[PDB]
Amino acid sequence: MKILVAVKQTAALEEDFEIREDGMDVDEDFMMYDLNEWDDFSLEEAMKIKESSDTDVEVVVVSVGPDRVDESLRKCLAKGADRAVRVWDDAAEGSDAIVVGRILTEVIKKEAPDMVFAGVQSSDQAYASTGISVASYLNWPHAAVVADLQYKPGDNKAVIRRELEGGMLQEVEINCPAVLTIQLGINKPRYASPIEEVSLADIGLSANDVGAAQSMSRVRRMYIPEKGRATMIEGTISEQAAKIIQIINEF
Amino acid sequence: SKILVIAEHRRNDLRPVSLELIGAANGLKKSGEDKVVVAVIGSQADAFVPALSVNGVDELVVVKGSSIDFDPDVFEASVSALIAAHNPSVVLLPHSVDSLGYASSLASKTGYGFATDVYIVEYQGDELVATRGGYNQKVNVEVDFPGKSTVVLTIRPSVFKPLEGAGSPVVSNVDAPSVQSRSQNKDYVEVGDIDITTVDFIMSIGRGIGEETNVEQFRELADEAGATLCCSRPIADAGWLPKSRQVGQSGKVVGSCKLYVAMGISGSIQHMAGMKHVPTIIAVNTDPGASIFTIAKYGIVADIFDIEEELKAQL
Ligand SMILES: Cc1cc2nc3c(=O)[nH]c(=O)nc-3n(C[C@H](O)[C@H](O)[C@H](O)COP(=O)(O)OP(=O)(O)OC[C@H]3O[C@@H](n4cnc5c(N)ncnc54)[C@H](O)[C@@H]3O)c2cc1C
Ligand SMILES: Nc1ncnc2c1ncn2[C@@H]1O[C@H](COP(=O)(O)O)[C@@H](O)[C@H]1O
């Protein structure tokens, strides 16, 4: 039995960040990197399956990214992932969700897992696209926004609950193997705060298959928009709290 | 040219984002002579023809596939066949849980442009230009689609205004491609309630409260204020307050609320979906960069525990 979990190391911006001089991205100096929040839940779900099974389950985490991503992969291993795989070449710079989908699929074909888990979306770009793209390239059954999974290793069907707008869920019976995008809250990750390197040649791809040029949208510019501004209440706690109380009553 | 809009329904009811996409499409098209084609997909979808026979709809296509409600395999095949039939320059999907189950699968197969969760869209000359967020909504990312004859966008809910009035589309019926789906829909489920946060005055707590033993002091603050205690998602995911008190896209929209006090809540898009309409929003957050400040009327950059204790003292 094998479960493959695709994970992303996301970037969050420090205060007072600036746009690069070319206007196409934020300056790298203002980025802090960590594992995508959705991926904590996806990994924990794979590990719950491993734990429940009296049979052997290999949990492999895979990320497409440059060498900074090793930090996140090592932490995944420390939490119990069996193996961790990083895929990269410089030519892959700027690969969008659909191209990442393609690269992950080339890895998954060689790994031949029994299920593939991905997060619902990334906290940085929130494409909510990558995992379902992998499903399309694999031509596998898929479901997005999975809040519950009833699955035994080697079954040929699973029952999932997908989380809808307003709070309702929908139970769906799905053929396995399947790609599932996993939602926040499906479980409680228990550790709340070598790596195998793969090149494009290893997976039969070239420069012309990956990167910004092969992406489905072209970035014209990134910029900091004018946004709504609150009326900031300055002063001590007592006056800030007084302000709030004056607001509460006028209501 | 044609713009194709995919409507959305669930549990016999049309979702209102459908009419938002129709407004978007009508705002977007380059000439009065361009047509907006709306498709509704489902084995019982004829029921929706009255609700989709509205201002701005030129053609309305009812697609009968094998399932009553959303199925990713049926929707991908059906939308693929609609694009083939209508040659649209732009296809608009809602950025919804259903669309997450197939939009990027539909785009992977093809020569189409694609972008998700779009909140600005226009033509500059003949060039379609779409804007979406980046870096947890700290920037706008403006994109175009060089040499793409067909662009698929998913559109952020509650941005585009619906048109008013009836319409008289040409209505047609098609069968979905004969695809045996690889999943089957089973029951809807409402998970296992004291208040209905369609109430007037809310104090809402987020991840900033830190630990479950800190919930009680807020429940006591709300008690004494006359507010109802609600939360953002992480609080309910942790089981600290019931899912019934969760505000946002997969929780409740607080439709009656006039004063909403957001404490240690960053203001994610999904949280804002539930509360951004509130006339007076106060945010209390130690991070001045938090998105919540972009919709709040009043902002206090302070520690929530210090404010809470003072607030309780002054009350
Ligand atoms: C499809 C889907 C559906 C979703 N549905 C919902 C939904 O229904 N409702 C919802 O809420 N979210 C929803 N989300 C989840 C959402 O993406 C965010 O994870 C969530 O809203 C973040 O919650 P938060 O603001 O409490 O936490 P965070 O983003 O972690 O923010 C915590 C805040 O507390 C502040 N803080 C920390 N300590 C203090 C202190 N001592 N004093 C003052 N401030 C402090 C921080 O500065 C930060 O701004 C959904 C997401 C997905 C993709
Ligand atoms: N570079 C990547 N490497 C591996 N998985 C990724 C990568 N980018 C996105 N993902 C997967 O897709 C999810 C994020 O969704 P999205 O918003 O579509 O990128 C993540 O939680 C991962 O499962």
CB contact under 8 A, B295 and A233: no
Q: Is B287 in the pocket of ligand 1 (CB under 6 A)?
A: yes
The four Cα atoms B263, B265, B266, B271 give a dihedral, to 10 degrees, of -130
How many CB pairs (< 8 A) connect A and B?
242
Q: What is the DSSP string of chain A?
A: -EEEEE--EEEEEPTT--B-TTSSSB-GGGEEEEE-HHHHHHHHHHHHHHHH-SS--EEEEEEES-TTHHHHHHHHHHTT-SEEEEE--GGGTT--HHHHHHHHHHHHHHH--SEEEEES--TTT----HHHHHHHHHT--EEEEEEEEE--TT-SEEEEEEE-GGG-EEEEEEESS-EEEEPTTSS--TT---PEEE-TGGGT--GGGSSGGGSSSEEEEEE-------EE--S-HHHHHHHHHHHHHH-
Asked if B54 and B166 touch (Cβ cutoff 8 Å), the reply is yes
Closest CA to B165 of B60, B59, B57, B54: B54
Can you list the domains of chain A with their CATH numbers?
1-251 (3.40.50.620)
Distance CA A113, CA B93 (A): 32
Token digits of residue A159: 């029952």
- Hey, whose CA ends up nearest to atom 13 of ligand 2? A119
B261 in the same domain as B173: no
B196 in the same domain as B123: no
Domain count, chain B: 2
Ligand 1 atom closest to Cα of residue B303: 42
E-strand ranges in chain B read 2-6, 9-10, 13-14, 35-41, 59-64, 90-94, 113-118, 120-124, 127-134, 139-144, 151-155, 170-175, 183-189, 201-205, 228-231, 259-263, 280-284, 298-300
B98 in the same domain as B14: yes
Distance CA B105, CA A181 (A): 13
B221 in the same domain as B183: no
Q: Is B113 in the pocket of ligand 1 (CB under 6 A)?
A: no
Chain B, window 227-286: residues with a beta carbon less than 8 angstroms from a chain A beta carbon: 233-234, 236-238, 243, 246, 249-252, 258-259, 261, 269, 280, 282-283
Pairing, β A169-175 against β A157-163 = antiparallel
Closest CA to B305 of B268, B264, B265, B271: B264
Q: Tell me which method was used to determine the 3D structure.
A: X-ray
Ligand 1 atom closest to Cα of residue A37: 19
- Domain final position from B125, B159, B189: B189
B260 in the same domain as B247: yes
B218 in the same domain as B75: no
Q: State which of A130, A180, A181, A195 you would mutate to test the pocket of ligand 2, scoring each by most atoms of that ligand within 8 A of its C-beta.
A: A130
CA atoms within 13 A on the CB side of B282: 25
B128 in the same domain as B247: no
The residue to which tokens 């309910």 are assigned: B236
B88 in the same domain as B9: yes
B107 in the same domain as B97: yes
Distance CA B238, CA B258 (A): 28
B77 in the same domain as B38: yes
Q: Which domain holds residue B43?
A: 1-189
B59 in the same domain as B106: yes
DSSP B42: S
- Chain A neighbors of B102, CB-CB under 8 A: 132
Closest CA to A137 of A209, A59, A81: A209
- Domain final position from B136, B161, B189: B189
Three-state DSSP state, B81: helix
Name A146's bridge partners.
Answer: A162, A182
- Domain final position from B189, B220, B250: B189
Query: What CATH number is given to the structural domain containing B153?
Result: 3.40.50.620
DSSP B202: E
